[PDB]
Structures are given as C-alpha cells and as structure tokens.
Design a protein around this ligand. Structure first.
Ligand SMILES: Nc1nc2c(ncn2[C@@H]2O[C@H](COP(=O)(O)O)[C@@H](O)[C@H]2O)c(=O)[nH]1
Lengths: 153, 123
C-alpha cells in the first residue's frame, strides 16, 4: 500500500492533469478551487498549485451550505456528503461553468463529473458524461487516459 | 498535463451530448442515435472499450414501471455502443428508475432532463 502523505500529493497530480483537458468558456486569471466537505486527501491541493500554462490554482476549503459556490469556485473537489447535502451543493453550481471531482468513487450516478478511487496501488476515477455534458465546461475525451494509464501496471 | 496542446478537435462531450428521452418513450430519436455514435466512436479512439449505462425516468408513474422503463432506455443506448464496436459484455446495463433525479421534477424542463441515460466510464 501507500501513505496518506503520498496519496494526497497524488490527488494533486491527477487533478492537475484533468484540468488540462478542461476549458472554461470565460477562462479566469486565477483558477479558484473549492474543497467542500470532509476530505482525506485534499491537504496537498490546499497548499495551492500552479498550472503548466502559467495559471495559479487558489484553493480554499468551503462550506456545504454555501449557496454561492457556483460563482465562487471554478473547480469543486467534493468531500464526504450525504445525499441531501450533495443535492444542495449541486444546486449551488447548477448553471455556472464548474468542474467537479469527488474524493470517493462510490457516488458517481448523479453529481460529479469525475470520481476518484484513491486507496490502492494507483489512483483512478470514474467519469459521468451526462454530468460532464451538464457541467457547462468543455471537457475533452482523451482525459479518460489518466484513469487507465495507472490502472495499467 | 498534455491536454493543453489540444486544438479544436473532438470535443464531443458538450451540452448537445445529453441522451434524453421523450415522455414514456424508450427509443432514440435519430438526433441522439447519432450523438451516441459520435460518443461511442470518441471512447474507442482513446482505447476505452467498456462503460456502464444507467437509465432514469422522471417522476410520473409508479416506481416498478419506471424501473423497467429506465432499464429499457439503457438497453436502447447499449445497442448503439454495440453497433459501434464495443463488446456487449463490456457494456453494463442498470436501471435506476425515478430514484436518482438530476433535476427538479416540479418543473417540465427538469422532467425532460431526467428522462436520460447516463454514460459512465469505469476505471
Ligand atoms: N485554449 C483556449 N481556447 C479558447 C479560449 N477562449 C476561447 N477559446 C476557444 O473558444 C472555442 C469554444 O467555442 P464554443 O464551445 O463556445 O462553441 C474554442 O475554439 C476555444 O479554443 C481560451 O482562453 N483558451
């Protein structure tokens, strides 16, 4: 197996990859990343990041019952939420171009575009394209190579 | 982060790509039939050969019926993926019925967006 430490930094790297396949219709100068709810592996991202394309990632932890999440965040990394909470949050985002990614990969039928599988020898994710199509951000299909590049030994 | 080099080519996951169904219908208007072929071709070109298809209904109806409805919707989409190259076994079919909405069923709009198949790509 691995370490919480290591795995955190891994979430950092796989996130950063996914960002590169995404397009905001009105691309902001600083990408705003909102970590929302209980997380195990968002410590890394919370340190902040910078993209390969110059842009810095400004990351804060945010509250589930914030209504204006959708304008406050370009990227939401969603933590542990019950079904009701999850609904609230996605009503917060509904409309606004916001990418969405879960720490856990059990909740991928409605809600997030990407769902991570983080325990285990490599990080993968499930992808929901209805969710993606609904997002209002442009996501390129070749991003799906990030999930199986590590699912392949 | 190789995704930055991507020009205008192959962005087949836009708003148009939603797979929606008419009230009580479980068969794909040729608009969506094509949408799907695009998608299914798009998945194959990146060496993904396996997906899970989850069907949903809106609100009207009793659950049992809508469950059965949703499954059919899913299987109608599966056939396209089959006709596009994907091994049928690599195509999981699930029916979630009215249980898991993505929109307000208290609204006509919402209900349309709920009668959908959702393509999920597993890792
Ligand atoms: N890479 C990149 N492409 C952009 C940017 N702004 C606009 N575009 C272009 O906007 C187009 C998307 O058009 P739309 O999806 O709205 O129909 C693409 O051609 C996309 O490249 C940008 O800031 N960066």
């Amino acid at each position: 197996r691995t370490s919480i430490e290591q795995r955190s930094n891994a979430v950092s790297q796989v996130l950063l990859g996914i960002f590169s396949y995404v397009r905001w219709p009105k691309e902001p100068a600083v990408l705003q990343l909102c970590v929302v709810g209980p997380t195990e592996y968002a410590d890394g991202l919370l340190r902040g990041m910078v993209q390969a394309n110059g842009r810095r990632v400004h990351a804060e932890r945010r509250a589930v019952d914030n209504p204006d999440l959708g304008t406050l965040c370009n990227v939401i990394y969603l933590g542990v939420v019950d079904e009701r909470e999850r609904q609230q949050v996605f009503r917060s985002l509904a409309g606004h171009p916001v990418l969405s990614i879960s720490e856990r990969g059990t909740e991928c039928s409605v809600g997030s575009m990407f769902c991570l599988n983080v325990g285990g020898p490599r990080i993968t994710f499930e992808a929901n394209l209805d969710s993606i199509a609904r997002s209002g951000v442009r996501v390129h299909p070749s991003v799906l190579k990030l999930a199986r590049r590590q699912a392949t030994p | 982060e190789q995704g930055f080099e991507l020009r205008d080519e192959g962005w087949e996951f836009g708003m148009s790509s939603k797979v929606l169904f008419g009230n009580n219908l479980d068969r794909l208007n040729p608009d969506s039939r094509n949408t799907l072929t695009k998608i299914a071709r798009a998945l194959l070109a990146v060496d993904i050969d396996k997906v899970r298809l989850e069907g949903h209904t809106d609100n009207y109806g009793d659950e049992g019926y809508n469950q059965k409805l949703s499954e059919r919707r899913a299987e109608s989409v599966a056939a396209v993926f089959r006709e596009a190259g994907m091994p049928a076994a690599n195509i999981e079919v699930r029916g979630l019925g009215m249980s898991k909405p993505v929109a307000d069923n208290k609204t006509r709009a919402g209900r349309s967006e709920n009668r959908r198949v959702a393509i999920i790509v597993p890792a």
